[PDB]
Design a protein around this ligand. Structure first.
Ligand SMILES: NC(=O)C1=CN([C@@H]2O[C@H](COP(=O)(O)OP(=O)(O)OC[C@H]3O[C@@H](n4cnc5c(N)ncnc54)[C@H](OP(=O)(O)O)[C@@H]3O)[C@@H](O)[C@H]2O)C=CC1
Ligand SMILES: NC(=O)C1=CN([C@@H]2O[C@H](COP(=O)(O)OP(=O)(O)OC[C@H]3O[C@@H](n4cnc5c(N)ncnc54)[C@H](OP(=O)(O)O)[C@@H]3O)[C@@H](O)[C@H]2O)C=CC1
Lengths: 398, 400
């Protein structure tokens, strides 16, 4: 049915999307797969989904993939490099592009898909956190359909009216009866720990997700709620929402994935299991649905559902991100970059848990750079913020 | 500007819907108001909204109203009788019809609107509980748009995809990725009560609705869960759902009003305040939105949200309703009727709380007439079931 190009096929999101196509072989055809260096995984994916093209970023990995596929008898054409990755995202025949490449490396490929007016299954966070302005403008000009894959943004999308779903980003919320967007989050493992003790929390304590384990980096972001701050930035761009049209709410059980408040008092919400196949399948099948392999949510086996307002004294990173948005893309990409450095430094036990927020603010207070005007400017800000951050860490550890 | 006729304007749903009109005078204009005998209320509504027509089912009430509006310089023309009520629902210029007349009455006025291809703001249980097949077949023929205002059905509607909303009753769930409809209910005040004590519960105890206070009759139906049973029958007709596509869930806090499960695992739900102005406003502005005067729900002042599966030993009436549906409109009509009689008998302390489900079942078992073909047929089944019910109550409240 629909032809897709998967950017970052060997990662977690890429594997989950391939599982969805595996559940619906007659509705989806994989024409191109793009990854980085995981040759072993790529081979298996190429051998199962018969893509016309397979692209590795690393030139060496590509050569290795090539000999592997030939030994296995596959005729999948192998390519290498960023340009090749962008070409796959712009293939004339592809309908959808699952944008799951992490970091700055996902920027150009995602943009190429946007400029080609493809339906974009957006998973890449950096896209809007650092290039929100540039990308939403690009989506408007090409008329590409953005479909948020991230759990929260996807739930919000599903809870939004039809006119906004179509023409996403440049549609008026107020004009479609939407009062605000309710962004939910678990609050992390330190939701009730004495503020006094936050400074002594260990990486292992911080990496225990209150509901289900994830990557260490993301787990820490969930403990500081920087993750929710980043999603706040994305949501603003994605749904064309002002500050007053955004509400952040702690929901410990993570059963409700996010909601939308309406003018008549109605609140629409999306609930489900903690399985990325659900959001992914929603975007791939939109406006229809398909089986994702996810089991039906059992309402009789749930913990009581609760809510609470986030305390900025406990989650300074959340407030930091909200303020950064109002300061511009330079501030948001800098915050994002600084956080990658400080979280990494926390996990490497170079700084304390509470130093993440402190150092993130310190880096931002030293930037004072102009608004990026292109992906190159963003990259420049990113590189600059990381150096400042690495220096901040080093002076702290010494 | 939307032109509307309000069937049963002086009631609770009627006043709430008129309050939505106040908040949006530039979006809605009242053309006709229909009521029964509350002349006092009608006067104020007529003076405030200046309807072109006003009608009272009661001949006398209408007479009095006609003179009061005249002496108070009102241009609204007063009519009377059911025929007039039905005409108001079919006025050519009318766009929407708030079907808020309760009981057997209102069946014909709501059908009139349906046959006229109007947009029906359905706020009347009898329509689908007793005339499910008849009304749904009729909406399919005339292409009338049904918009449920009842809290649960409205929540389900808002949580359904667009293709189903625009072809309500016609479109099928599976094709649109819907696996089931989750109908939620509070469970009543006897949710935790020891099963053996139910027989000694008094009217005052059964009439304590868990969250928001309400009518005695409906409070009792909430305690036996007959209310949810009746809603189950309506939902299957309204959303074209099979038994396996229906799920009944107890949700004590009643914050979530109902939900819908999707093929990919997604569950969509509608939450809000108990205020009926929300659902009413939703249907009136659909596919758009309008301010209803209802303040946003504060998620920080909520009780923990819980869910549970209904135990049929505790809620026999829920099960009776589900079984009645498989038997047709004759059985659902008779069940509804019997329940009116038994609940009223319970309130009058002629029978025990547990005698409601017991007698409801008993009247169903004695019913013979099968599947009505027109509303007149269901009216006949209704009348017959009421009589059988009354005799069962008298037999039990004298002999047994
Ligand atoms: N994990 C989750 O639950 C969610 C993730 N997201 C976001 O969406 C994205 C999904 O990444 P995720 O799957 O989680 O994790 P991974 O980091 O494991 O996936 C990243 C993928 O991108 C590939 N890649 C890395 N660098 C390059 C490059 N330079 N050129 C081309 N491909 C490259 C990797 O290939 P290889 O491994 O072969 O090197 C891998 O397939 C992230 O940006 C994440 O923040 C959003 C919501 C949820
Ligand atoms: N209450 C609620 O929250 C909800 C109710 N519903 C359903 O919708 C309907 C709404 O009734 P509700 O407003 O609650 O309560 P009421 O019984 O107070 O309202 C009924 C209305 O119908 C009028 N009426 C009664 N008999 C006749 C008749 N023979 N001819 C014309 N008009 C007549 C009444 O007029 P008058 O008083 O002047 O005689 C009154 O305006 C009910 O069937 C109910 O089951 C659905 C969802 C919610």
């Amino acid at each position: 049915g629909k032809q897709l190009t998967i950017l970052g096929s060997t990662g977690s999101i890429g594997c989950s999307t391939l599982d969805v196509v595996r559940h619906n072989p007659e509705h989806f055809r994989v024409v191109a797969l793009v990854a980085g260096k995981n040759v072993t995984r790529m081979v298996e994916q190429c051998l199962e989904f018969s893509p016309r093209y397979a692209v590795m970023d690393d030139e060496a990995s590509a050569k290795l993939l090539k000999t592997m596929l030939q030994q296995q008898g596959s005729r999948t054409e192998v390519l290498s490099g960023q340009q090749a990755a962008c070409d796959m995202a712009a293939l004339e025949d592809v309908d959808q592009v699952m944008a799951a490449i992490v970091g700055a490396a996902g920027l150009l490929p995602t943009l190429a898909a946007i400029r080609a007016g493809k339906t974009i299954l957006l998973a890449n966070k950096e896209s809007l956190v650092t290039c929100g302005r540039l990308f939403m403008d690009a989506v408007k000009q090409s008329k590409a359909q953005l479909l948020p894959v991230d759990s929260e943004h996807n739930a919000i999308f599903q809870s939004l009216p039809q006119p906004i779903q179509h023409n996403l980003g440049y549609a008026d919320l107020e004009q479609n009866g939407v009062v605000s967007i309710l962004l939910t989050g678990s609050g992390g493992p330190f939701r009730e720990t004495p503020l006094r003790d936050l400074a002594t929390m260990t990486p292992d304590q911080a990496c225990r997700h209150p509901n289900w384990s994830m990557g260490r980096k993301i787990s820490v972001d969930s403990a500081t709620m920087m993750n929710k701050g980043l999603e706040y930035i994305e949501a603003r761009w994605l749904f064309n929402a002002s500050a007053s049209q955004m509400e952040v709410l702690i929901h410990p059980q993570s059963v409700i994935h996010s909601m939308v408040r309406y003018q008549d008092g109605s609140v629409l919400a999306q609930l489900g299991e903690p399985d990325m196949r659900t959001p992914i399948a929603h975007t791939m099948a939109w406006p229809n649905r398909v089986n994702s392999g996810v089991k039906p949510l059992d309402f009789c086996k749930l913990s009581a559902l609760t809510f609470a307002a986030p305390d900025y004294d406990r989650y300074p990173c959340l407030k930091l991100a909200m303020e950064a948005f109002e300061q511009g893309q330079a501030a948001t990409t800098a915050l994002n970059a600084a956080n990658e450095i400080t979280v990494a430094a926390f996990l490497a036990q170079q700084i304390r848990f509470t130093d993440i927020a402190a150092l993130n603010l310190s880096v931002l207070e030293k930037m004072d750079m102009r608004e990026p005007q292109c992906v190159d400017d963003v990259l420049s800000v990113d590189a600059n913020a990381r150096e400042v951050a690495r220096k901040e860490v080093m002076r702290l550890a010494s």
